[PDB]
Each structure stands twice: as structure tokens, then as C-alpha cells.
Design an enzyme around this catalytic site. Structure first.
Site: not given
Ligand code: ZN
Length: 258
Positions: A62, A92, A94, A104, A117, A196
Site C-alpha cells: 500500500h 512513509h 501518501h 491526506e 508521515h 489513516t
Molecule cells: Zn500515513
């Protein structure tokens, strides 16, 4: 089946396997800069990353995580709205399929190209596993990425992605310094929230930095070449691994600056 970000297994389907998805303190949220309350009591953040020890980078299906040795107080976060010491365990990102989406959290409804993050856990609890079960178990530092000039400190990460293109792939990733990902200013917004991605536990104190860092389009382009799938399976590009904004509900966002 397994959760993901697709039409049939994306964010809107998560509540069926993880009812907490519809909880009272879910993340991310939209930060309304006009209604955020400046709080004079918030102390400055203390980021001590000079002894940080990175070990490996992994494609988990993911996104990708850079993991750190958290067996000692090497890379810690304290101060701000936090009580106690929080150890860095991994970071990581997003991102989106396009430069106009990917983050996010949003600021006054504005979306950034990506969001980094840095996950830390409260040492009072002994291990990451116990910490996620507590309301003050985690502290996550969120940093926005905008497309502009290249971030020199991000290149090492960008270069190794070829090595972990598919799900399950991991590579040695030692001597990486996370200080090269920090913006100049440490002013921030803070509110109580959650992870999240499933299990979406409400154990997080979010610390979102006001100042975004810039990365080149060539740098974010390499993120978009990763795969959600495992080797030997139909190629599914890893893009748009972000959850949309959730209701703020009974919560107030506080600002460390005026
Ligand atoms: Zn995250």
C-alpha cells in the site's frame, strides 16, 4: 477482500471490516486556518534525529516504509503538545496520480502533491504494539510536499525504489538521515486523531507542519512507478494511496503560531 484504494476495496468500503472508520476521532481532516485556535501554552517541538539508525526500506503493498532501529532513544520527538518521549519507528508517504492531489490532510481545502508521515511511539508503553492501544500512544509528524525544486535529501530514497517495485520487496537502507526532509520552520497545527490506514486506531496526536517542503516533478514521478501488486501479477501502479478528509466532530485544532 483485502483493503486497498480501489473502487471495490477503497476508503468507502473500510468500515465493513473496521467499524472504527466511522468513529469520533478519525484522520485525516481539513485544517480550517481561520477557526484553528492559537494556543500560547504549546511549547516548541523538539526533534532529536542526530543518532537515527535506518535499517531497511519495504514495499508493503500500500506504500513503502523506511524503518529505523527503535530499541533505544536514538531518534526521538518531544515537546510541543506531547508529554514524554516518542521514538521514531518508520516514515512513509501518501501521493497522487497527479500533482494536484496526494496529501491526506488539506489546508483550507487545499491538497498538496504528497504527504510524509514520521511515526513515533510513546516509550512509556514499551513497544509499538502496546502503544497503538492507547489514546496518547502515537505522535505523527505530517509534512506536505509541493512540486517545485528538488529536495537533495530525498534523492537517496528515490534512487532505491527500483529495488522494491513490487509488494513484499525489501532492501537494506542504512545511514539515511531524516533531518534532510525537514522544512526550515517547525510551526504546527495539532489535534487528536487516528491512523489513516486500517486498523485506523484512534491513538494518534497529529502534529502537522505549516511549511511544506518542495520536491521536483521527476522525484514524485518515481513514486508513481511503484506497484501495488506482487511480482508476476498484473501491473497496478501505486498512485492515490490517500484517504480523504473525515468529519472533525467534537474536536478543536490548535496552532502553535499566530
Ligand atoms: Zn500515513
Amino acid at each position: 477482500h483485502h483493503w486497498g484504494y480501489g473502487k471495490h476495496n477503497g476508503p468507502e468500503h473500510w468500515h465493513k471490516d473496521f467499524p472504527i472508520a466511522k468513529g469520533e476521532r478519525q484522520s485525516p481532516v481539513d485544517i480550517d486556518t481561520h477557526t484553528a485556535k492559537y494556543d500560547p501554552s504549546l511549547k516548541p517541538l523538539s526533534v532529536s534525529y542526530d543518532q537515527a539508525t535506518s535499517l531497511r526500506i519495504l514495499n508493503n503493498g500500500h506504500g513503502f516504509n523506511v524503518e529505523f532501529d527503535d530499541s533505544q532513544d536514538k531518534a526521538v520527538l518531544k515537546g510541543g503538545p506531547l508529554d514524554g518521549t516518542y521514538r521514531l519507528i518508520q516514515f512513509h508517504f501518501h501521493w497522487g496520480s497527479l500533482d494536484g492531489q496526494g496529501s491526506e490532510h488539506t489546508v483550507d481545502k487545499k491538497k498538496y502533491a504528497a504527504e510524509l508521515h514520521l511515526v513515533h511511539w510513546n516509550t512509556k508503553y514499551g513497544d509499538f504494539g502496546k502503544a497503538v492501544q492507547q489514546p496518547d500512544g502515537l505522535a505523527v509528524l505530517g509534512i506536505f510536499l509541493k512540486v517545485g525544486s528538488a529536495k537533495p535529501g530525498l534523492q537517496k530514497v528515490v534512487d532505491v525504489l527500483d529495488s522494491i517495485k513490487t509488494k513484499g520487496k525489501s532492501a537494506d537502507f542504512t545511514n539515511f538521515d531524516p533531518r534532510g526532509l525537514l522544512p526550515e520552520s517547525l510551526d504546527y497545527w495539532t489535534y487528536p486523531g487516528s491512523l489513516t490506514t486500517p486498523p485506523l486506531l484512534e491513538c494518534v496526536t497529529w502534529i502537522v507542519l505549516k511549511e511544506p517542503i518542495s520536491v521536483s516533478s521527476e522525484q514524485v514521478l518515481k513514486f508513481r512507478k511503484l506497484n501495488f501488486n506482487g511480482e508476476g501479477e498484473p501491473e497496478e501502479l501505486m498512485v492515490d494511496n490517500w484517504r480523504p478528509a473525515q468529519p472533525l466532530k467534537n474536536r478543536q485544532i490548535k496552532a502553535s503560531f499566530k
